[PDB]
Amino acid sequence: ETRDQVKKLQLMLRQANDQLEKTMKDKQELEDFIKQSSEDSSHQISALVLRAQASEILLEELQQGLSQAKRDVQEQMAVLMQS
């Protein structure tokens, strides 16, 4: 019985070590995954909205600017209309 206890014990230990060894890999890997990952989340996201609000607005200068060129050019037909 003693020696059976010793095989089954050698099984639990070898198997468990390949497995521990696995988890230390997966884990340490993974932190490396997210570190750089949330870096890309971040860096990108900021560079991104900076484009939104620096750009999505750039257009109402037009939102108003078209309505002016529509009022002045509707006017030129009036600058001609007395002529």
Partner: protein, 303 residues
């Protein structure tokens, strides 16, 4: 710490040239017993604990003889015991405490998606102070496990629920009914993933003086607490006012790990590509526009 209380406790009883001894040796006798009885049925464990509580409670009145005063001693006595005893009595290996402690830890772990739009909690965390006391209620339920004794514990319960009422009041400026309350604390627990949660609770239920639990401030808090909790395990879409569709949905195709950042990572390149697109098109009419205006100006200005 199994070291230290031996001093503090004595400092308390030393004023008594009469009853101090009278209670002390009496206690440590059967208490000496409980190290031997550590292997007896757990129900029997809380049993000779609730017995010894109640028994001193009658006996002092029998020889030594006011209940106006008891609530204040009830802390200290149990303090000395739990200091040596926590180790034997917390989360029994014989029991399922460990098991449901992890069941709940995962249960709440999966709760990362919650908003009080679903629950309609009457708090608004946007104000710095409000979130500061929010944080504190949580810091309290976290710190809840740290305490070896259940008095310091039950005080973390109280104190937490207190940092919750506080935020309830600053956010509302009307105080809170439990219409304005339960979903709050749940909002805090949900945010606590509180540690050794289950076995802490049961350590209290089984080990603490029941009167400080029934009459004391602590009773209502611990109560509505466990309610909030065992409710959380048994949860309804239709109690969230949600269809079976969302209820299954947020947990059904998700919880695949790390995929979420991947998806987010794809998306993110898609959008930034789009805003580069829109922008450069509005630049197309930055130019393509004026040439109409000045063009209808100059090309027509001729005659």
């Amino acid at each position: 710490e199994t070291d230290r209380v031996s001093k503090e406790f004595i400092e308390f009883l030393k004023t008594f040239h009469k009853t101090g001894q009278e209670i002390y040796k009496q206690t440590k006798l059967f208490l000496e017993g409980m190290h031997y009885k550590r292997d007896l049925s757990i129900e029997e464990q809380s049993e000779c604990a609730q017995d010894f509580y109640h028994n001193v409670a009658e006996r002092m009145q029998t020889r030594g003889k006011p209940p106006e005063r008891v609530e204040k001693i009830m802390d200290q006595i149990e303090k000395y015991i739990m200091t040596r005893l926590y180790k034997y009595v917390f989360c029994p290996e014989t029991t399922d405490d460990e098991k449901k402690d992890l069941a709940i830890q995962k249960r709440i772990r999966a709760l990362r998606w919650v908003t009080p739009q679903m629950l309609c909690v009457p708090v608004n965390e946007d104000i710095p102070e409000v979130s500061d006391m929010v944080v504190k209620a949580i810091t309290d339920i976290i710190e809840m496990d740290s305490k070896r004794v259940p008095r310091d514990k039950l005080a973390c319960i109280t104190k937490c629920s207190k940092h919750i009422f506080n935020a309830i009041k600053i956010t509302k400026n009307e105080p809170a009914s439990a219409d304005d309350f339960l979903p709050t604390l749940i909002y805090i627990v949900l945010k606590g993933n509180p540690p050794r949660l289950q076995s802490n609770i049961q350590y209290i239920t089984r080990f603490c003086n029941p009167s400080r639990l029934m009459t004391g401030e602590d009773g209502y808090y611990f109560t509505n607490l466990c309610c909030a909790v065992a409710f959380i395990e048994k949860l309804d879409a239709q109690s969230l006012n949600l269809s079976q569709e969302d209820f299954d949905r947020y947990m059904s195709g998700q919880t695949s790990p790390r995929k979420q950042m991947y998806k987010n990572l794809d998306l993110l390149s898609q959008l930034n590509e789009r805003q580069e697109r829109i922008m450069n098109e509005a630049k197309k009419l930055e130019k393509d526009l004026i040439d109409w205006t000045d063009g209808i100006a100059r090309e027509v200005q001729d005659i």
